[PDB]
Each structure stands twice: as C-alpha cells, then as structure tokens.
Design an enzyme around this catalytic site. Structure first.
Site, mmCIF file in Angstrom:
data_model
loop_
_atom_site.group_PDB
_atom_site.id
_atom_site.type_symbol
_atom_site.label_atom_id
_atom_site.label_comp_id
_atom_site.label_asym_id
_atom_site.label_seq_id
_atom_site.Cartn_x
_atom_site.Cartn_y
_atom_site.Cartn_z
ATOM 1 N N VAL A 165 0.808 -1.228 0.000
ATOM 2 C CA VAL A 165 0.000 0.000 0.000
ATOM 3 C C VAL A 165 0.844 1.282 0.000
ATOM 4 O O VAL A 165 0.312 2.379 -0.201
ATOM 5 C CB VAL A 165 -1.052 0.036 1.155
ATOM 6 C CG1 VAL A 165 -2.198 -0.942 0.884
ATOM 7 C CG2 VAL A 165 -0.405 -0.221 2.516
ATOM 8 N N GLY A 166 2.150 1.134 0.220
ATOM 9 C CA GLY A 166 3.076 2.265 0.171
ATOM 10 C C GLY A 166 4.151 2.210 1.237
ATOM 11 O O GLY A 166 4.563 1.130 1.666
ATOM 12 N N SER A 167 4.611 3.383 1.662
ATOM 13 C CA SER A 167 5.660 3.473 2.681
ATOM 14 C C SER A 167 5.106 3.968 4.010
ATOM 15 O O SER A 167 4.094 4.678 4.035
ATOM 16 C CB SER A 167 6.804 4.374 2.209
ATOM 17 O OG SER A 167 7.406 3.848 1.039
ATOM 18 N N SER A 217 8.386 -0.149 4.556
ATOM 19 C CA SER A 217 7.283 -0.463 3.583
ATOM 20 C C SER A 217 6.144 -1.205 4.264
ATOM 21 O O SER A 217 6.365 -1.979 5.203
ATOM 22 C CB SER A 217 7.793 -1.246 2.370
ATOM 23 O OG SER A 217 7.906 -2.635 2.647
ATOM 24 N N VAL A 218 4.932 -0.939 3.784
ATOM 25 C CA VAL A 218 3.689 -1.371 4.434
ATOM 26 C C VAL A 218 2.823 -2.176 3.453
ATOM 27 O O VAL A 218 2.711 -1.813 2.282
ATOM 28 C CB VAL A 218 2.887 -0.149 4.972
ATOM 29 C CG1 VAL A 218 1.604 -0.573 5.674
ATOM 30 C CG2 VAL A 218 3.737 0.685 5.908
ATOM 31 N N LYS A 230 3.858 -3.537 8.820
ATOM 32 C CA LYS A 230 5.008 -2.729 8.453
ATOM 33 C C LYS A 230 6.282 -3.522 8.692
ATOM 34 O O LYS A 230 6.529 -3.971 9.810
ATOM 35 C CB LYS A 230 5.002 -1.451 9.298
ATOM 36 C CG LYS A 230 6.022 -0.391 8.927
ATOM 37 C CD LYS A 230 6.070 0.674 10.029
ATOM 38 C CE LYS A 230 6.836 1.895 9.586
ATOM 39 N NZ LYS A 230 6.831 2.921 10.662
ATOM 40 N N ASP A 258 2.992 8.004 13.100
ATOM 41 C CA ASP A 258 4.359 8.542 12.929
ATOM 42 C C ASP A 258 4.884 9.497 14.025
ATOM 43 O O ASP A 258 5.846 10.232 13.794
ATOM 44 C CB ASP A 258 4.470 9.220 11.553
ATOM 45 C CG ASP A 258 5.909 9.422 11.103
ATOM 46 O OD1 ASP A 258 6.450 8.495 10.450
ATOM 47 O OD2 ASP A 258 6.474 10.519 11.352
HETATM 48 C C1 LIG Z 1 -4.054 6.059 5.038
HETATM 49 C C2 LIG Z 1 -3.762 4.680 4.456
HETATM 50 C C3 LIG Z 1 -4.652 4.488 3.232
HETATM 51 S S1 LIG Z 1 -4.272 3.168 2.290
HETATM 52 C C4 LIG Z 1 -5.144 1.837 2.779
HETATM 53 O O1 LIG Z 1 -4.639 3.523 0.944
HETATM 54 O O2 LIG Z 1 -2.873 2.835 2.307
HETATM 55 N N1 LIG Z 1 -4.010 3.649 5.457
HETATM 56 C C5 LIG Z 1 -3.056 3.264 6.339
HETATM 57 N N2 LIG Z 1 -3.346 2.454 7.398
HETATM 58 C C6 LIG Z 1 -2.387 2.092 8.273
HETATM 59 C C7 LIG Z 1 -1.078 2.535 8.094
HETATM 60 C C8 LIG Z 1 -0.006 2.169 8.996
HETATM 61 C C9 LIG Z 1 1.264 2.622 8.767
HETATM 62 O O3 LIG Z 1 2.334 2.302 9.578
HETATM 63 C C10 LIG Z 1 2.310 1.413 10.615
HETATM 64 C C11 LIG Z 1 2.528 1.897 11.904
HETATM 65 C C12 LIG Z 1 2.500 1.013 12.971
HETATM 66 C C13 LIG Z 1 2.281 -0.347 12.755
HETATM 67 F F1 LIG Z 1 2.266 -1.156 13.818
HETATM 68 C C14 LIG Z 1 2.072 -0.842 11.462
HETATM 69 C C15 LIG Z 1 2.093 0.056 10.389
HETATM 70 F F2 LIG Z 1 1.904 -0.363 9.129
HETATM 71 C C16 LIG Z 1 1.528 3.441 7.672
HETATM 72 O O4 LIG Z 1 2.684 3.863 7.468
HETATM 73 N N3 LIG Z 1 0.512 3.819 6.785
HETATM 74 C C17 LIG Z 1 0.821 4.690 5.640
HETATM 75 C C18 LIG Z 1 -0.801 3.354 7.004
HETATM 76 N N4 LIG Z 1 -1.793 3.701 6.148
#
Ligand SMILES: C[C@H](CS(C)(=O)=O)Nc1ncc2cc(Oc3ccc(F)cc3F)c(=O)n(C)c2n1
EC number: 2.7.11.24
Length: 343
Positions: A27-29, A30-31, A46, A161
């Site tokens: 879904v982006g930044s 890695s996640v 993540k 963050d």
């Molecule tokens: C806002 C996005 C919309 S979408 C589904 O289109 O990607 N939703 C979303 N939902 C959750 C996250 C969680 C993150 O970071 C984390 C932070 C803590 C953790 F335990 C796990 C993570 F992935 C993280 O960077 N991002 C960008 C996240 N983004």
C-alpha cells in the site's frame, strides 16, 4: 508458542509473516495491507528496512517499538501485534509491526475543496484529544501533517508517525515543510510540545478554507508567509532565539503587524478564528496547549473532561544513552518477546 511462518516476495524483499495474515498487498511506505484470519480485521503490517545496520537505525528501531507499545488511545495508532520469524536473539534481524488498516489520510478527504464546520470540529477535536494523551507522556510528534492523520469511514481519526526527514525532502515547494513550526523549521531554539499545536493550526486552517495556509516555495519564502499573517517577532521572543545567525536574519526583516484573522478566514465560525489565533502564535511559550484547546468553546459539543485521558508515564531515559548495535538489538528483542496483544 511460535506459529508457522510463510514467505513471500512483495516490496522487493521477502516477507516472512505468520500464517494468520493472508492476502498481503502493498500500500506504500514499507507497508502491506493484509487480512487477519485470527481476528477478521483488515490490518497494516510494516516491515522495517535494515533495523540494525547502524547504531542510529538500531536505536530508531527500538524507539519506534517503544513508542507504539506505550500508546493506547482511540486517536493514536495502536499496536495489534509485533513479530519476528527469528527463534533466538542470535537470528534476530527483522521486525514486523501490525496495526489497523486505515481507510484514508486527511489529504484524501480535503481534496482541494472545503468541509463543513461540524466536520472540522470533530476532526480537530480528535487530533487534540490524541495530542493531549501523547503530550501527557512528554512525547512530541514533531511532524504532524495531513498524510500522518488517518481516518475510517465514520470519520474516526488516528495519529501516525509520532516521536520519530533528510535535507532535500524538506526543500522547495513541499507539503513536508508546510506544517512546521517556524522555530523547528529554522532551528531557533530548544523546542517544546507546542510545535505540534502550530501544526494543528496549519491543518485546521486548511480544513476550513480547503487551501494550504503557508505553502512556501522554500524555507525563507515560507517564513515570509508566516510573518505576514502573525507579525514579526517583538523583543521578548528575539531573546529566546538561541542561534545568533537566525536572530540576526529575522532582525533584517521589515517589521510587520499581526493581521486580522476574521478578515483572512472570511465567513468562518468566530470561535474557529479565535482558536486559530491562539494556536498560531509565534512565541511557543504563549501558544495554547492541547488540554487548554480542548476546553475552548469551539468544541462545546464534543468536549468531555472525563473522556480525555492522559498517558501512563513514558520512560525515555534511553534517548540519551549510548549503546552498541548488539545492545540496541537485545533491548528490541526483549520488547518484541514480551509484547501482549490487546483484547
Ligand atoms: C491512510 C492509508 C490508506 S491506504 C489503505 O490507501 O494505504 N491507510 C493506512 N493504514 C495504516 C497505516 C499504517 C502505517 O504504519 C504502521 C505503523 C504502525 C504499525 F504497527 C504498522 C504500520 F503499518 C503506515 O505507514 N501507513 C501509511 C498506514 N496507512
């Protein structure tokens, strides 16, 4: 005990996660997004890039893990799970963090257009409720902005963050610098918790008008936009700026008086304007706090003093501690192993 772990190449690295997590999609930044068959929830997982490649990376890894484990609040991103496929400290080299997958960041909802006053109330109320919890633990976000504020479909909001940018990504016409308190943007001083309230004010303004409040083409241009609105600093603030170079530069600038916020934010709720004037104060000692802002009349429909909790004490003695990579790794491993998933 230890579940079964399967492997999968996703973000040019192989993700080894427990079996319970299925349908992993980047879904982006890695996640990655995933489905937690164990809970029925959609999750964000993540993977940290080279967590112990240097002292700084190792420390930052430990910092992040420490921050997320402490934070338990509706309006703050919470940890559902953390894991490693490693069975001993000797094999430990990958850290995975799990939270709720959030629908949209604040950027996506704003979309150039304006929002209703009730909507803005609810959203700013939630950030402030989140911030009060965070600040009660002496944690500062330091980098609050729309892309760090994630929302579900009922407009329930979480901050991401907190407590965690290079030289070039802060340069030019970039949303990465637009929400930054001028003291930290220009390194004026040892900065306090109210850097974050400056960011809220920037965000709130943008929510009311649908437009960036201080869209600077660069550091100096952004400063000029800021002083146009709030006025040039007086004698008391100039003394507090520790950097002599910076103090000397501001003292080069033609004096400007604070503007009328009612005339800037035409048509807006006068309580909004008043709140904005208290957030967007140059001298950080005089800026309103999240606690105080929550008791402002603007939020009368949402404000409940018994439903705005403070955090448990946060021990960040580690921040001024110098350890070896191995020592940072060992501390991090203990935190992974001891984690208890929420109900
Ligand atoms: C806002 C996005 C919309 S979408 C589904 O289109 O990607 N939703 C979303 N939902 C959750 C996250 C969680 C993150 O970071 C984390 C932070 C803590 C953790 F335990 C796990 C993570 F992935 C993280 O960077 N991002 C960008 C996240 N983004």
């Amino acid at each position: 005990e230890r579940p079964t772990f399967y492997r999968q190449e996703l973000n040019k690295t192989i993700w080894e996660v427990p079996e319970r997590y299925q349908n992993l999609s980047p879904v982006g930044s890695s996640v990655c997004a995933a489905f937690d068959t164990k809970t029925g929830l959609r999750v964000a997982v993540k993977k940290l890039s080279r967590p112990f490649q240097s002292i700084i990376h190792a420390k930052r890894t430990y910092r992040e893990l420490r921050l997320l484990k402490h934070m338990k609040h509706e309006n703050v991103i919470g940890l559902l799970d953390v894991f490693t496929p490693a069975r001993s400290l000797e094999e430990f080299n990958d850290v995975y963090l799990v939270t709720h997958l959030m629908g949209a960041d604040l950027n996506n909802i704003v979309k150039c257009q304006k929002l209703t006053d009730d909507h803005v109330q609810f959203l700013i109320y939630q950030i402030l409720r989140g911030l009060k919890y965070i600040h009660s633990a002496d944690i500062i976000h330091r980098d609050l902005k729309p892309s760090n504020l994630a929302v579900n479909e009922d407009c329930e909001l979480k901050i991401l963050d907190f407590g965690l940018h290079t030289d070039d990504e802060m340069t030019g016409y970039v949303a990465t610098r637009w929400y930054r308190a001028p003291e930290i943007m220009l390194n004026w001083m040892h900065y306090n918790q109210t850097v974050d309230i400056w960011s809220v004010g920037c965000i709130m303004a943008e929510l009311l008008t649908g437009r960036t409040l201080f869209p600077g083409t660069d550091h100096i241009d952004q400063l000029k936009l800021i002083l146009r609105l709030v006025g040039t600093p007086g004698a008391e603030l100039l003394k507090k700026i520790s950097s002599e170079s910076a103090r000397n530069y501001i003292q080069s600038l033609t004096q400007m008086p604070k503007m009328n916020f009612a005339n800037v934010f035409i048509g807006a709720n006068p309580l909004a304007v008043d709140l904005l004037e208290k957030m967007l104060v140059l001298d950080s000692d005089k800026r309103i706090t999240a606690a105080q802002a929550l008791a402002h009349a603007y939020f009368a429909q949402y404000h409940d003093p018994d439903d705005e909790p403070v955090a448990d004490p946060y021990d960040q003695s580690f921040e001024s501690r110098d350890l070896l990579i191995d020592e940072w790794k060992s501390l991090t491993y203990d935190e992974v192993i001891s984690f208890v998933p929420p109900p």
